[PDB]
Design a protein around this ligand. Structure first.
Ligand SMILES: Nc1ncnc2c1ncn2[C@@H]1O[C@H](COP(=O)(O)OP(=O)(O)OP(=O)(O)O)[C@@H](O)[C@H]1O
Ligand SMILES: Nc1ncnc2c1ncn2[C@@H]1O[C@H](COP(=O)(O)OP(=O)(O)OP(=O)(O)O)[C@@H](O)[C@H]1O
Ligand SMILES: Nc1ncnc2c1ncn2[C@@H]1O[C@H](COP(=O)(O)OP(=O)(O)OP(=O)(O)O)[C@@H](O)[C@H]1O
Ligand SMILES: Nc1ncnc2c1ncn2[C@@H]1O[C@H](COP(=O)(O)OP(=O)(O)OP(=O)(O)O)[C@@H](O)[C@H]1O
Ligand SMILES: Nc1ncnc2c1ncn2[C@@H]1O[C@H](COP(=O)(O)OP(=O)(O)OP(=O)(O)O)[C@@H](O)[C@H]1O
Ligand SMILES: [K+]
Ligand SMILES: [K+]
Ligand SMILES: [Mg+2]
Ligand SMILES: [Mg+2]
Ligand SMILES: [Mg+2]
Ligand SMILES: [Mg+2]
Ligand SMILES: [Mg+2]
Ligand SMILES: [Mg+2]
Lengths: 311, 311, 311, 310, 311, 311
DNA sequence: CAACAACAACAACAACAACA
């Protein structure tokens, strides 16, 4: 995977500066390479010449130049995709949930976003030949609606051992936006040691509705949301982990629209809209995607996770 | 239960600051740890560095990091469930009413929400081996429809002493939304000294239909409801008290929909829909739940509380 | 019982604000302690700080905290119930007509709601040891069907002097919904001087059928009805009077359903359904009650008021 | 009795506004006092402040406050009742037809409804000494069965002059369920210009069966009937006149009055007429807040209505 | 094409000076000619007389005097335009995308900016008689939204060799504003060696929203944006490449406006506004242009790229 | 017109001195007369006595003493004014664009300053009886926004031949502030040979925004702008040509302010402010003028140049 | 004494009989 920051120690860099970078949140040389000069200067005790030298030596460790489109196509041909637990949804997504990007599913209440998140979290531990990502998973839950019983049910359905799928899922709760960002920081610190494949944030904008209320607090809310989404995107680009976030809806009074403004719209790569059907059936539609045609699919949440409709 | 806020005094914090935090609403380390920096800053006489130290020591007191899913499963397997008073409904709920969450029962009038609330209030004092929670009950009532006669009848049915049942139930009445929020603040203040198991708000969204009228003040109504539900969620996560709220319905002109909107749709954890059949028989259906299948059950309200329908 | 606004003057407030509140409609410290901040702010000439100050002093005047259920039981056991003039109906209601809660009686035409209202108005003047409270009565009549000869007949049946029986009965006909609300305002203003025990509104929703017509203005009609019922409930709670209202019915076109929608259903406390029987006899059924079991009784209307059927 | 609306002109309201109100239909201060603010707003050119000011002044004009049951008892004892021409029916109703209220008479066809209406119309001209309010009658006839010959017969029976009896009877006919409302609107000016003691509608619900048909037009029919009955009640309460209306009957698949709950709840007194043997009929009180449920016997003689000749 | 800077060497200037100028970014005589004195002085190792001599030779090599308008008209008539992929859009721009200038397309999310950029990138390699520019395309992408599949689809639609169109497209990703600005130096370095006819930046102002947050950082953000746009304009004037930049949108909040401010408004030459209508159809409008009227052409994005709407 | 510098030689001045003056930038006797002693002594090879003789002879050639105000009034009535292409705007300016003075237009983007400049450039060549200046015109453009198509359209509107009108719009482009300033020397050199009546510069302060950045470079920027404006004023007073300049705008975060500071405010004589109205209609408001009062006017840029608004 | 823009969100209200 990514080269740890210890390599920078072998480039004429003092140990205390490396420790300062590590405690600032840059646990990988990729983070320092992608860091602008302002971020590397805002940390106290760092001089302009020191930051210039650090960036100069970090630029040699990772390629940041011009490459032909054929090389990019070859690189994209090795992108792992994780099955969503339904054959129809897998066909609709043309492979499944993509890694290295942000895919957000939004809809009304009880539509089935959390069930999909649970099924993805338990599925990503599967071997690659079976459609998994062959890695652990993380769940930063903000609504307190994490139920390991569903994970056990899906593990029983797929035949895996429940103990292992339980032991290979990190969990955390967010009580406020600041705690959410600190959880992202701790996830960045932790991910450098083991192999992670999924990172679920359900839901990303639940706490922003209550913490930032009113009109005069709109700009600060948008700035904080933008910083959070930028951190998520940086983590996805660095560690190559599939980031799945959940979004709510709001009324179109005088008819529902996803919340979060233009920041969430321009920060996501794939967007899915989930809507209610009849009894236990739900409909998924590709709201926005750079290479996926606008289509629809039908699914249902059975007693063993998400799957195809029992028609 | 939660550690009292006085422990913060043993972490180099002035007594007057702790008194200010207590008068602001925070009476435990958990409440302070769950609050963002904005809320603490909003208190007058509090500096930025002092607040940062306060949250630092609060986070040191109570863990907030990542834990394996098996630890969460072990924690969840030791959660008390309060019997609803009916065996069929107990089977439907897979244990009864769960603590630490929000259960909202809604339906038309005459369905039996108040009777269910009364039965839960009386039976939450039972020993754990009988399905109780072994704690005092609270009743914040807004419609002026609290009758101790039903509590006496259920106490006679289960055989406990009526005097102790009446003595171990706190009651209060709400005349407007502001008084409802102040009652919640007083409940937070008084819950830290004794052990409480249930907290009933019937109805949660009854006054909001009258105080806020018209399209002009819809946003203010939604914001106030969101703040009230956030306070309820904070109380539930703090003291581990089973919160039961009651909701009404509205007619779908051009056919009944629960009032409150997306705020109460997303704030609640478990939702039950109660409908009227014939005679004294009623039908309860699980509307929204993260780990409970959509099913139905039949019950009735006899002379001694809610129970199974006579066949 | 109620404490006039004058007591606020000795608590720090001046006289101009007291006069302004009296103009607004609050003639009691209880009535001003039951109002939200937005209601007092709407009175022009009152500042936010002044409103907070007066609300704090009013909350200091009357208790609004948490009380044990045993205290509520003691308070509830000392309320007065007024007999309806029939032994069967008195047994059915387990005491008669309560005070402090809304009792709605509905049925088809010719059924006999107005006779019951007249008999209750006469009985409202009986000594407390004979079946009724000790106070005067009112009659807001919106159909022009107030017949004093029935009052004289019932007073002769029980045995009283007709002069003071008729003297202690207010009356005011209503010609429109706005006039009805202004009549309620005048009743609230005038109730503080003397002792009142019955507030009859017959019919409560008779003018709403004609004043508001069509689907377009249904929401405004419902909002106005909700405001009227909220004012009625506030008056009943503040002055401790027995409010009795009458309601009409409509045919359930593909069979009688009371009019008023969910507002009247959720605003009332005791609902009775009166139905024509055979000849002169009628049957009264408990439609809805939080503590009275669903039963029915048999009665009639003789030449001297309502009473038990003669067999 | 009623105070002309011109008074409102003198207290600070433009004459144009008073003329507009008179055009709308409010010919009396009482008429504009009994109307809600919403109704007054619907008139174009009337502002919120102007409507509030005129409503407040009108409320200052009329005593809309709270009274005592003794005063209402004195007011009730000061009303007049009009004899129906039969002693049995006179004693059945404890007098006659009370003014300021609505009396609906219904039954099967050919049961002496129009005969009773004619006798009541001719009786209201009597001096108070022998019943009647000493006024003039109005006949809004919808069925077309108004014969100006029974009136002469009853006038001859009572000894009154025929020409004066026939002179003061304002007759009009309605052809659909839109001319009735316009006739009622026009009746306000005639009632404010001269004393009127009886308004007769026969039948109240006759054209509604044919103009409105099917389930689709049921709601509109009920709304229009409610508006018509509300206007009738407003006129009765305003001008202190007695309204007598005639209602048809419908079979049951066993006869019940038509009109639904609207006419049942909008009528104060209800009488049911049934046929017996020969030329004898029975009148029974259906719904009444004070009169007990009883029956009386009456016959339609060759001269007028009255007690049966036995 | 542009004359390489080596022609200066045989003009009286030292080769070391030419190398020093080369490392600064001036790889062409045109770049040195279009340079103020301070720009050529701030580079170390350059004297005043030496800079004056270099500027004198640069002015001698490149004509900078007045010219009759007919010659400019002829030169404008010899300007190549790149087919946009739609016939009505080609009619809208009176040809295609102009070369030697800056065109900026902006709109809300999922409106078709990236699809248009991809279609232009593949179309630029067409022979000059089919509307192409007969060169190579460069793609600087700042959102990770480059998909070679769309390029392959459009190449198959136009009957090209997919391998060649993949081999003749250069790609780069910008992880921060500094990297985005520094990519242009490499772009200029690699543009002289071969023939390039299209440079796409998508998006130009995406990273400035998050990197430069708050209010105190507004002036620095505007200065950096101005420098970046000036460098883009210098590239366009130097190598005669069609520069296509992408711009986002922002809400007004007491209704959407492009971001960037007056700098982007005045720097760009042609401005296009793209909006979404119904289904798969979009509307394109001309916002700012010196010689094109305000029209509202209409198009769509099918599986083979941009194209005409299907009725 | 102005007397050429070929008159000081036949007065006792060596031809070498005249050649030196011509090289320095002074091509007419008036330019040397207006040159102060400090400016002329800066020329290499010029002594104090030679300079004194030169200024003495120049002052002898052209009068510089006091003139009675009626002579100035007579000379003021012999000033040509150029029509702006709109009759209403011509009425607003009371004749048109005055010669021998500096006019400035500023506004937001797409407001229509370049269109007005093009219309003035093409109409300047009209005969005097039609409102033209009878002379040629020039165009020093900095943004590369010169489009001969608009000139051809207006020439078609006025009926003049396209080739003849194109052959007299000698145009140049400025790539930096130094080049923009040095273009004026060539403009003065070519102005003495033919008849010119326009010196359009669009825009004057475009390059100064990016060439000079930061607070440290403010004083040098202001000094250079002052020198450029002084050269423009000297040219206008020398050759009697109408100088028209275009100014950008900036926002007011603490709302539009023309850029350039007090130097351009105190240098320009007539300042007009252009604003965007609705659709194709624009509003022109006179900002600053010592002769005409503040007023507003309406115009529109149709498909064939600027003109009156379409009604 | 000069110069620099940006940020969305919130649901609710029932009613009308008739035909051998
Ligand atoms: N064991 C189960 N078997 C079948 N269906 C289930 C089961 N558990 C939950 N469900 C279904 O899950 C649905 C709700 O899904 P989920 O909790 O994921 O909603 P969500 O919209 O993502 O939640 P939220 O927005 O409130 O966070 C319910 O309608 C219910 O039918
Ligand atoms: N002692 C009793 N015995 C039997 N049934 C009873 C008794 N007391 C109340 N009920 C029943 O309670 C029912 C009403 O239920 P409940 O009082 O809980 O109201 P609810 O549906 O919660 O309505 P709301 O709170 O909106 O007024 C009635 O139908 C009545 O039959
Ligand atoms: N003096 C009396 N003696 C006996 N019965 C009487 C007497 N007065 C009225 N009634 C009875 O009253 C009954 C009607 O009751 P009431 O006047 O209270 O009507 P209501 O249905 O409440 O009125 P509404 O629906 O029109 O508002 C009639 O059936 C009649 O028999
Ligand atoms: N001159 C008369 N002498 C005796 N009886 C008469 C005379 N004129 C009419 N009648 C009687 O009048 C009765 C009909 O009464 P009336 O004309 O009032 O009908 P109605 O019940 O009002 O019916 P409709 O529904 O047609 O209005 C007949 O039975 C007839 O015997
Ligand atoms: N293969 C495809 N077939 C049809 N339409 C497609 C296909 N791929 C993407 N789309 C369409 O592309 C649209 C989004 O356009 P695009 O990807 O160019 O985004 P954009 O608005 O320019 O945003 P951004 O700059 O954030 O990428 C979607 O609405 C979708 O309908
Ligand atoms: K939920
Ligand atoms: K000036
Ligand atoms: Mg969920
Ligand atoms: Mg209840
Ligand atoms: Mg009644
Ligand atoms: Mg008739
Ligand atoms: Mg894009
Ligand atoms: Mg321009």
């Amino acid at each position: 995977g990514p080269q740890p920051i210890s390599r920078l120690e072998q480039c004429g860099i003092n140990a205390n500066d490396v420790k300062k970078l590590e405690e600032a949140g840059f646990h990988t040389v990729e983070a320092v390479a992608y860091a602008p000069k302002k971020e590397l200067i805002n940390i106290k005790g760092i001089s302009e010449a020191k930051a210039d030298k650090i960036l100069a030596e970090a630029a040699k460790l990772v390629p940041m130049g011009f490459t032909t489109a054929t090389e990019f196509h070859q690189r994209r041909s090795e992108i792992i995709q994780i099955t969503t637990g339904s054959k129809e949804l897998d066909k609709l997504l043309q492979g499944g949930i993509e890694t290295g990007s942000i895919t957000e599913m939004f809809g009304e209440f009880r539509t089935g976003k959390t069930q999909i998140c649970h099924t993805l979290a338990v599925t990503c531990q599967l071997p690659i030949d079976r459609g998994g990502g062959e890695g652990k998973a993380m769940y930063i839950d903000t609504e307190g609606t994490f139920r390991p019983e569903r994970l056990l049910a899906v593990a029983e359905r797929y035949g895996l051992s429940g103990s292992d799928v339980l032991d290979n899922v990190a969990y955390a709760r967010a009580f406020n936006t600041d705690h959410q960002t600190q959880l992202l920081y701790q996830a960045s610190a932790m991910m450098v040691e083991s192999r992670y494949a999924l990172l679920i944030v359900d839901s990303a904008t639940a706490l922003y509705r209550t913490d930032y209320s009113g009109r005069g607090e709109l700009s600060a809310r948008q700035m904080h949301l933008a910083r959070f989404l930028r951190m998520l995107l940086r983590l996805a680009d660095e560690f190559g982990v599939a980031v799945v976030i959940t979004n709510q809806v709001v009324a179109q009074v005088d008819p529902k629209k996803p919340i979060g403004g233009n920041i969430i719209a321009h920060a996501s790569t794939t967007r899915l809209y989930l809507r209610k059907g009849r009894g236990e059936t739900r409909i998924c539609k590709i709201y926005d995607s750079p290479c996926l045609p606008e289509a629809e699919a039908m699914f249902a949440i059975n007693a063993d996770g998400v799957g195809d409709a029992k028609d």
